[PDB]
Write an enzyme that holds these catalytic residues in place. Sequence first.
Site, PDB file in Angstrom:
ATOM      1  N   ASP A   1      63.741  45.250  40.417  1.00 12.71           N
ATOM      2  CA  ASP A   1      63.853  44.103  41.342  1.00 12.71           C
ATOM      3  C   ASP A   1      64.922  44.414  42.390  1.00 12.71           C
ATOM      4  OD1 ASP A   1      62.040  41.627  40.510  1.00 12.71           O
ATOM      5  OD2 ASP A   1      62.839  42.418  38.607  1.00 12.71           O
TER       6      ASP A   1
ATOM      7  N   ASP B   1      47.530  38.005  38.111  1.00  8.57           N
ATOM      8  CA  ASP B   1      48.208  37.272  37.063  1.00  8.57           C
ATOM      9  C   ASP B   1      47.236  36.256  36.496  1.00  8.57           C
ATOM     10  OD1 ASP B   1      50.468  38.670  37.957  1.00  8.57           O
ATOM     11  OD2 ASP B   1      51.017  37.050  39.348  1.00  8.57           O
TER      12      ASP B   1
END
EC number: 4.3.2.10
Lengths: 242, 200
Positions: free
Chosen positions: A11, A119
């Site tokens: 990240d 997702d």
Amino acid sequence: MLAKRIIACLDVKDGRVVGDPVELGKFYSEIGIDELVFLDITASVEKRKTMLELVEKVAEQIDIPFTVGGGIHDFETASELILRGADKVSINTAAVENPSLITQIAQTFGSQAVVVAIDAKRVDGEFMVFTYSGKKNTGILLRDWVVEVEKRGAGEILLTSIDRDGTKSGYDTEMIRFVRPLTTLPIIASGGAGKMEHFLEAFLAGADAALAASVFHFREIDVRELKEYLKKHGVNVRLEGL
Amino acid sequence: MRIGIISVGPGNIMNLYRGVKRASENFEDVSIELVESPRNDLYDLLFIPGVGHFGEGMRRLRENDLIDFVRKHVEDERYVVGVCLGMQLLFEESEEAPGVKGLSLIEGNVVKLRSRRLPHMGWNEVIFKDTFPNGYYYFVHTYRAVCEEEHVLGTTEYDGEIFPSAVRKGRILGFQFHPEKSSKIGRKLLEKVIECSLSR
Ligand SMILES: NC(=O)CC[C@H](N)C(=O)O
């Protein structure tokens, strides 16, 4: 023969891993990670040019493929990041809302360049596709989305099982199997990995690559030890040597 | 050691530059120039990189007058090394570009792989006949070369099909994979290529 891929996910923010992203990725390349993926969370006003220096910096020193993502909302964005030096971008929401974005990317930079992130979540006994960081049910069936994704030109599916994410309960191998015969696109499993065994499973279910985050960064699984392990259970992986 | 890397061709060429630059770090007098046009003199080592369709390949060479330049390099026994689409352009014709003539520097043609999952994308294993180090390198391609065995340098197998992942004809060398994206083993190969061209 083709190797099962071990992918690491970092990240980023303000050009920094939430170490120096170029630093850590270079180290991941030296210890035997097969691919890097940066998911970007910089604010809204800054994202554009930050994501650009990140790619610009990574691409100056990394010697393996790397994917960039987080808030890639249009072709222009996708285009600047690839021309900047990223091997591919990942798109999710903007993919679902505008599927020709996938073909515009595939046709311009090649199918190699587009990783579509899906997702799904089991709702009423069905695999349903969610957008907005797993927050909106599009009411679109995974099965329907997976076929469209191939048909539009994407090179790969990064498949994330929302509920498994953070659990350490293992990959969603049921999701992988459902998706497996539905597409010829390489599949990356994401969310759930806790122990070396879990990688084997996802690979046995038919995943082409496996991605993890903390467990790599924070060192429950060893990349070196994960592969030899996998190697011991009939899974063909890439293994340096010395 | 004057190194050229052709920079017209389609797709990203700078990673190759950056890795060739990395691989050359420990060598004396390394000059590495982006070659957009024919020069007055010839390089010691000339790279033809490429990502995209065979036709674009040839046209970006042709539009910029690099056919004779790349050609005069072979006439003076200088190292010429094709990378990815560059390897394919080394051949005569290709299924990917129905009317389009290659450099035809090495005998043979280019053909679509046989798999249902095209492109052949990811790490696959290369076995060489000599010189270059066997191991896993990163690939991305739908097409494959077809040549005689005397030219095959490196072998790869993808979904049952065995193809040349590397090729060679005297000082002409071709690689199908991306050295610049093949980690440590990729430098190693690149260093070796340089080392070949240090010799004559
Ligand atoms: N990916 C590339 O552009 C490599 C050469 C060719 N276009 C192929 O797919 O085989």
